[PDB]
Structure 1
Amino acid sequence: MFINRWLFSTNHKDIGTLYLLFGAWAGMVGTALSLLIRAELGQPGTLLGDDQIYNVVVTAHAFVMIFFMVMPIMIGGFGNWLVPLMIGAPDMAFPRMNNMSFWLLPPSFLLLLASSMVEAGAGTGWTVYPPLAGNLAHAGASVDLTIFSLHLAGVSSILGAINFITTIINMKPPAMSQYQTPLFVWSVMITAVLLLLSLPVLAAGITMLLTDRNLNTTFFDPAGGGDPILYQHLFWFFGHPEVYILILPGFGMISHIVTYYSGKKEPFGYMGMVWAMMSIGFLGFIVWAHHMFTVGMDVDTRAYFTSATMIIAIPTGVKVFSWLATLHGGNIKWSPAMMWALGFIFLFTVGGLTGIVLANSSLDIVLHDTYYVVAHFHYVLSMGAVFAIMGGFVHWFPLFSGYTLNDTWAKIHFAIMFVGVNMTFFPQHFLGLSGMPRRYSDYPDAYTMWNTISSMGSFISLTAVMLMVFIIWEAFASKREVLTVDLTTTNLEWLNGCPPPYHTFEEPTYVNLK
């Protein structure tokens, strides 16, 4: 049975669980790689050795947190758990295909871990730019194994997107229009269209790099007429869309949590939040050259990308100001998960502006390849995308398990993590102003104090990560069974009991046409 239940599954819930587990393990590896980074920078001089071994660690840290932690939990975990229960569907359009999207991910990881143990590992950065990533500087299997990680990891994603979109479009109650599906449901649909359209061009680019290293093409080799910059475009054509992928479902959860814990029966401005993400999606595709402002491109182009990158702030504003209105005259219940959402709203808005800075080709001249950039995207990812994750996880843990966590403990967790990521990253704003470059094992004497402090923060964030492993145990150890849940009348997921049965909606919901 066990082999039939977990290896062979066609259960949208049992598959969600597999992802929550995979993405939890990934996080452990992601954390270690991030601690190592700040071990090396926490005092002047050299700890591991040269920039090489350092950048294999930096690079790996990026792929694991992005591709094996944030997308696997957020899309595959919470997707596969919540989506079908929010639209009263019994499972996913393509449940067999759903499971291959899972089992393609261990492999994908193992090729990544292989890469770091073959030759001197692939310290190329997560951008994998030729000619460093090419067969003369990075001769060996490392960079090939990394390209193969991404191929499998992009097949998982694209197959999983086909599944969600076909599920959310096709398998609602007949009476239900798209305009009466929850915000999460919307977030995931949009996030699957971004995946569907961007990952193919990512794959195409890393395919030309394989055939430059192995089959004697010259796509990115000036010797044969090629252009290294061509690669930057195809990758960033994917790579902006990749980040609105990583936040959109966070929008989703955050719209949910702030609504449920303000005691409101729907979030403020439903259709506003629909227009917002369909915009953020759309404009997220027409901005990719803001990652390439020091490559030497025509001034008329650079000013378009500046201006286009900044339009995104209006629809993102609408969402910030909505959540805040969803709190207005709420009956605020001060749970851990409300704390996670509240933090999101302010540290996302910090990071969000620090990137409107970056929108200006002018400044990015000086801010490009400094920590200022690292600071921007650790506020939106570490202090947004992970806050959504811990928020959601905290709010929905009893639905998956049937047990409660200890809320005191779980605020003690929020408390320490808050102090850790802010002390980690608030000083990185100062470093990049003072012009500390990225991707350096060692720094000029000047930059020491902030680098000491930044790394102290990364040791507080570790206490957090260890506490959360002991808080998951306690709850299972203790086995306090959920009895009753509020606000069920507007939150269909909670209607089938914690945890809900293997087969849900075996008999579909009644919804009539008025």
Structure 2
Amino acid sequence: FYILVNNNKRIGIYYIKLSIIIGILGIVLSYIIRVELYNSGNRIIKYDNVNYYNMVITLHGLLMIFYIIMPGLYGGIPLYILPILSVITDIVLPRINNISIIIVLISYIVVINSIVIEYNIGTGWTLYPPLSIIGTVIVNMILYGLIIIGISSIISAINFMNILIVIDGIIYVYIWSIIITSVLLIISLPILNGILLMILSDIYFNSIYFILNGDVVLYQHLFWYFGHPEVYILILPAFGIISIILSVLNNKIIFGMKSMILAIIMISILGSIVWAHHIYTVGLELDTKIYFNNLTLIISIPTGNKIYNWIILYIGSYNILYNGYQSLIFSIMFIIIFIIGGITGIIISIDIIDIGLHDTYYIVSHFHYILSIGAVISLLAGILLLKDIIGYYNVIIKINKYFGLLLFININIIFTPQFIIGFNVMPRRILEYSDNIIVWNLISSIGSISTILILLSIF
């Protein structure tokens, strides 16, 4: 059978397969955005169809976060190796594992169908009210997709937590990475569901939470109380992969295993209490701002310890071993790239700097360097390491120095200029802009078309 299979390794393959498929839609949307932003004027979207651009950016964000990177790094690699790393025959909950992937596909079909049938409008992937609650039915459909996705995420989290009860070996760092992400999901998702239900109540049940005398800033608190834990639910599995690859390929035992583990635990606790750095410009109280700014800067400490522990893993490794394997290059590239993204995160963490840089393309470049570059490369590196175990073929990736170089160069051509226009300043979530920002926007656009072309050479 195909759909009935409960094999945990087969389901892991399904997650990667579906992430690539849905990923095609994600990348296409990204190409639309960059094409439009190539100059000033209308290029591929009419001025009377500006609502489509708002929908393109909204769906891009939602799909890449919840339907591509999360299903790939928390559903794909985890479901394939975690039961093996735990020296257990199979996953604890076989039937739940099957329904989770089916749920993801069904929620994807709902979203894309809503593109085709509903009027196309957008409110960002952060679905801020009151804009989200005064929209058309496409917003209702997107809400159903998120809630359905939430069901799959929570049940998958329950599945991984049960490994503690059955693990027959040692909890390796990677296993710790997934367990903590599962804990972060169990604690953050129920809050998200509540606020999403309130968005529905105002959309569909004549509720009045997001109209005057009701505080719209309330949504942002509950949303981001899940929002930021989400960005670490998306990065922590990547960290777990990086640890395995560096140790295996360099033939070096992980250094400071317990510090790696305790760094992951620390990032989670801290990541659960820093959400309001996304709400700096709303007008929060001075002491609140100072608390959140202080705790946000603390997250660098545990995150920094992991980075340096990775570096010493690559240091001192034997020279005779060939170092041009794509998996090793990607793992090393992750350290180089993640530091850029994190440092810019610390810059935006200072609220006074953030006043200038909120809702600008500097924020875009910041989270792209971590996700669009770092997380993607980590997932690629992990799949590449498991090529023999997974068994896929008909691609030229394993040893392809051209692909790695071209990808690194062109991805930086896209997002490095977006840091510059952040002090120009070019707001986010816009399509038209002043003529004096064309140069940098044009350079980034040339980078986007080039990256897409390099994706064709792998076949």
Q: Same fold (TM over 0.5)?
A: yes
Partner of 1:492: none
Are the counterparts in 1 of residues 173 and 261 from structure 2 also a CA contact under 8 Å?
yes
| Residue number in structure 2 paired with 1:66 | 65
Distance (Å, rounded) in 2 between the aligned partners of 1:408 and 1:23: 20
* 2:259 corresponds to 1:272: yes
| Equivalent in the alignment of 1:484 | none
Which of these residues, 136, 149, 153, is aligned with residue 149 of structure 2?
153
Shift of 1:409: 5.5
Measure, in 1, the Cα distance between the counterparts of 2:454 and 2:201: 44
Question: Which residue of structure 2 lines up, in the alignment, with residue 450 of structure 1?
Answer: 440
Secondary structure, counterpart of 1:104 in structure 2:
helix
- Going from structure 1 to structure 2, the CA distance change for 1:445 and 1:426 (only over 3 Å counts) comes to same
Q: Secondary structure at the match of 1:281?
A: helix
Matching of residue 413 in structure 1 with residue 403 in structure 2? yes
Partner of 1:46: 42
Q: Distance in 2 between matches of 1:322 and 1:390?
A: 22
Contact 1:398–1:404, Cα closer than 8 Å, also in 2? no
Confirm or deny that 1:466 pairs with 2:456. yes
Shift of 1:119: 3.6
**Cα offset for 1:159?**
0.3
Instruction: Name the CA distance, whole Å, in 2 between partners of 1:110 and 1:26.
Output: 10
- Shift in CA distance, 404/467, structure 1 to aligned 2, threshold 3 Å: closer
Determine if the alignment matches structure 1 residue 300 to structure 2 residue 300. Answer: no
**Quick one: which of 2, 5, 22 aligns to 1:9?**
5
> What do you get for the CA RMSD once the two structures are aligned?
1.4
Correspondence list, 1:249-398, <5 A: 249-264=237-252, 266-331=253-318, 333-334=322-323, 335-398=325-388
Deviation per CA, 1:190-247, whole angstroms, max 9, x where unpaired?
Answer: 111111111111111111011101111112221xx31111111110000000000111
SS in 1 for 2:52: helix
1:114-153 to 2 correspondence within 5 Å? Answer: 114-135=113-134, 138=135, 140-153=136-149
Distance 1:452 1:432 in 2: 15
Structure 1 or 2, whichever has the larger Rg, is 1
Structure 1: 5+ residue stretches without partners = 471-514
Once residues 60 and 68 of structure 1 are traced to their aligned partners in structure 2, the CA distance between those partners, rounded to angstroms, is 10
Give the CA deviation at 1:43.
1.3
Distance 1:386 1:18 in 2: 17
Provide the C-alpha distance between the structure 2 equivalents of 1:352 and 1:78, rounded to a whole number of angstroms: 24
Q: Scaled by the length of structure 2, what TM-score is found? A: 0.96
Secondary structure of residue in 2 paired with 1:7? coil
Identity of aligned residues (%): 39
| CA displacement, residues 44-67 of structure 1 (integer Å, 9 cap, x when unaligned) | 112202442111001111111111
Match of 1:83 in 2: 82
Offset from partner CA, 1:461-506 (integer Å, 9 cap, x none): 10222223x1xxxxxxxxxxxxxxxxxxxxxxxxxxxxxxxxxxxx
Cα distance in 1 for residues equivalent to 2:442 and 2:140: 36
Are the equivalent residues in 2 in contact too, given 1:199–1:238 (CA < 8 A)?
Answer: yes
The amino acid of 1:390's aligned partner reads L
Q: 1:35: how far off? A: 0.4
Q: Distance between the aligned counterparts of 1:438 and 1:407, measured in 2?
A: 34
Question: For the structure 1 residues 259 and 207, does the alpha-carbon distance in structure 2 shift closer, same or farther, using more than 3 Å as the test?
Answer: same
User: Is the 1:154–1:199 contact (alpha carbons within 8 Å) kept by the matching residues of 2?
Assistant: yes
Correspondence for 2:167 among 169, 172, 175: 172
Taking structure 1 as the reference length, the TM-score comes to: 0.86
Deviations 1:436-477 (A, max 9, x none): 100111110110000000011101210222223x1xxxxxxx
Shift of 1:404: 8.8
Q: Is the CA contact 1:184–1:252 (under 8 Å) kept in the aligned structure 2?
A: yes
Q: Which amino acid aligns with 1:243?
A: V
Aligned amino acid, residue 318 of structure 1 = N
d(CA) in 2 for partners of 1:287 and 1:408? Answer: 39
Distance 2:64 2:317 in 1: 35
Q: Which amino acid aligns with 1:452?
A: L
Q: Is the 8 A contact 1:280 1:316 kept in 2?
A: yes
CA deviation vs aligned residue, 1:97-121 (integer Å, no higher than 9, x gap):
1111110011111221133224432
Describe the SS at the equivalent of 1:134. Answer: helix
1:247 is matched with: 235
Q: 1:212 to 1:256 in 2, by over 3 A?
A: same
In 2, Cα distance between equivalents of 1:403 and 1:45? 44
Equivalence for 1:234: 222
Do residues 184 (structure 1) and 205 (structure 2) align?
Answer: no
Q: Matches of 1:380 and 1:116 in 2, distance apart?
A: 28
Given that residues 262 and 333 in structure 1 are in contact (C-alpha distance below 8 angstroms), is that contact kept between their aligned partners in structure 2? no
